[PDB]
Amino acid sequence: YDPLAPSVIADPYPFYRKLRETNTVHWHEFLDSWVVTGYAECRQVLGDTTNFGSDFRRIDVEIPDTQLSVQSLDPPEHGAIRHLLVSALHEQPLSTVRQQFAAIAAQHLAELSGQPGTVDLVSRFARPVALRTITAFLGVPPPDGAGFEQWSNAIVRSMDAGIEPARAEPGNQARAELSRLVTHWLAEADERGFVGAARRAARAQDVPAAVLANSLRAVLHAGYESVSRLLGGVLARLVRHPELLAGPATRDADEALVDELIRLDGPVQADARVCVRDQPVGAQLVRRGDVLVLFIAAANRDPAVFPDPDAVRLTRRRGLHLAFGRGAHACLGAGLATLQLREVLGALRAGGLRLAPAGPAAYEPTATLRGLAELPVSVR
Amino acid sequence: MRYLH
Ligand code: HEM
Ligand code: NA
Ligand code: NA
Ligand code: NA
């Protein structure tokens, strides 16, 4: 299983399935990590921060204080910055957020109506919608979309530096570039929006400023890339299966549909942990110091939990999929992302546009965060 | 492979 091989990138799920069917916890000797594809095993590891951590300092790896961030901190340090970010999120009025997200989606769909040629939904919809969405939520002016995507893409590709080490350095430069962007916003941002709220919250709580800046960069980059890649994958499915949008289109029906779309097309393919204390996982004894890569997109296709796992089924139990993670590090923006995809579905139905394939979905060589390079369609 | 922004 070469995660960056073109045939794997074209469609990794059959390879995930072959892995899962042979062993839910495989040792990958060249990557020096456990590969976890079973739902039960991924759910176990995500929720157990006592024996599996995200802060490599807990296995005696040197991490400078200037690089600490909400994603790479474990209790008790994680709680302070986590609560700070959640408090800032909860201060945002949802009526305004939903109005902004709905208008952004409608505007970009309207620009596509009347296009007689082939249009790429990645560059023309998924990315620009995601960029304006996250910056509206943050309360900051959107940067140039093409330029921001270029810097952001370097960070995405750096998530695979364990496979291709040359990807690490461009990612570090890009992280520094986005950090200066966040630093400018912290200094100048209006009181309206998430940045203003996080700034207010930080004054009270006491968080290292470096953690706050690094954590705000995570909110920006996670918000942009996760939403962008989710929208692309969902659109890829809808263009091939337009019947998915021909359903009842009630609040409750779309709840089930959105849940299935996130389960199937959630872009996070891999979510890593380090073992802090020996613990059985699947058939294996995982040892302190071991790395585990949780293939959560594979876990969302485990047939023991999701029968007919590759299909949208509107009658599944809610709250099962792992596309937002689980436990202490569960996605801060899970509610924003579901609200956003809901509005996208609603804008598509009100737009009355039919989106037929004008060529194959083409996938970028990124293994940790799945993303389309191009999604060519005709608009009628 | 690490989902780290
Ligand atoms: C505006 C939208 C989003 C924002 C602001 C956002 C922000 C964040 C942040 C800050 C974290 C780190 C939380 C922590 O470590 O305590 C996180 C975690 C996570 N996010 Fe998101 N995210 C967004 C959208 C998404 C989407 C659409 C997906 C997948 C469909 C996703 C998947 C995840 C996962 C799996 C984690 C957990 C990673 C782990 O286990 O450490 N996120 N998100
Ligand atoms: Na641009
Ligand atoms: Na070890
Ligand atoms: Na493109």
What is the β-pairing status of strands A362-363 and A291-294?
Answer: unpaired
Question: Does the annotation flag A43 for ligand binding?
Answer: no
The pairing of beta strand A291-294 with beta strand A271-275 = antiparallel
Tell me the two tokens of residue A255: 């709840």
Q: Shortest CA distance to A211 belongs to which of A72, A309, A117?
A: A72
Sign for the CA dihedral angle at A104, A107, A113, A116 comes to negative
Closest residue by Cα to residue A257 from A190, A179, A182, A313:
A313
Contact A340, A229 (CB under 8 A): no
H/E stretch holding A141: none
Please report how many Cα atoms fall inside a 13 Å half-sphere around the Cα of residue A342, on the Cβ side: 17
Rounded Cα distance, A104 and A95, in Å: 14
Residues from chain B that touch A177, judged by Cβ atoms under 8 A, are none
Does the beta-carbon distance from B2 to A163 stay under 8 Å? no
- What are the backbone dihedrals phi and psi of residue A118, each rounded to the nearest 5 degrees, phi first? -80, 135
- Contact (CB<8Å) B1/A155: no
* Cβ atoms A351, A113 nearer than 8 A: yes
Compute the distance between CA of residue A60 and CA of residue A51 in angstroms, rounded to an integer.
Answer: 15
Nearest in space to A207 (alpha carbons), one of A64, A78, A55, A57: A78
Q: Is A7 helix (H, G, I), strand (E, B) or coil?
A: helix
> In chain A, whose CA is at the least distance from the CA of B1?
A160
Q: Of A245, A268, A280, whose CA–CA distance to A337 is shortest? A: A268
Question: Rounded distance, CA B5 to CA A27, Å?
Answer: 26
Report the C-alpha gap between A294 and A37 in whole angstroms: 7
- Between the CA of A130 and the centroid of ligand 2 the distance, in Å, is 13
Report chain A residues whose CB lies below 8 A from the CB of B3: 71, 159, 268, 270-272, 368-369
DSSP 8-state code for residue A330: -
**Which 8-state DSSP code applies to residue A288?**
T
Tokens of A188: 């100048």
Experimental technique: X-ray
Cite the beta strand spans of A255-331 per DSSP E. 271-275, 279-281, 284-286, 291-294
Give the separation between CA A6 and CA A19, rounded to whole angstroms. Answer: 18
- Taking alpha carbons only, the member of A364, A330, A118, A380 closest to residue A228 is A364
Cα atoms in the 13 Å half-sphere on the side-chain side of A202:
18
Residue type, A149: E
Q: Å resolution of this model?
A: 1.8
- Domains observed in chain A: 69-264+313-379 (1.10.630.10)
CA dist A53 and A69 (Å) reads: 13
Max CA pair span of chain B: 12
**Whole-angstrom distance, CA of residue A119 vs CA of residue A85:** 37
DSSP secondary structure letter of residue A161: T
Please give the helix or strand (H or E) that residue A236 lies within, else none: helix A209-240
Residues after which chain B is discontinuous, using a C–N cutoff of 2.5 Å: none
Q: What share of chain B is helix, strand, coil (3-state, %, to 5)?
A: 0, 0, 100
Under 8 Å between Cβ of A138 and A188: no
Burial class (CB in 10 A: 0-12, 13-18, 19+), A380: exposed
Which residues are bridge partners to A90 per DSSP?
none
Pocket test for ligand 1, best of A132, A155, A226 (most atoms within 8 A of CB): A226
The answer to whether the Cβ–Cβ distance between B1 and A159 falls below 8 Å is: yes
The alpha carbon of A71 and the centre of ligand 4 are apart by a number of angstroms equal to 29
Pair of tokens at residue B5: 């922004």
Which residue do the tokens 């093409």 mark? A146
Q: Could you tell me whether strands A279-281 and A362-363 are parallel, antiparallel, or unpaired per DSSP bridges?
A: unpaired
For residue A71, which residues of chain B lie inside 8 Å, CB to CB? 3-5
For residue A357, the number of C-alpha atoms closer than 13 Å in the C-beta half-sphere is 11
- B4 → closest Cβ in A159, A269, A367: A159
What backbone phi and psi angles, to 5 degrees, belong to A145?
Answer: -65, -45
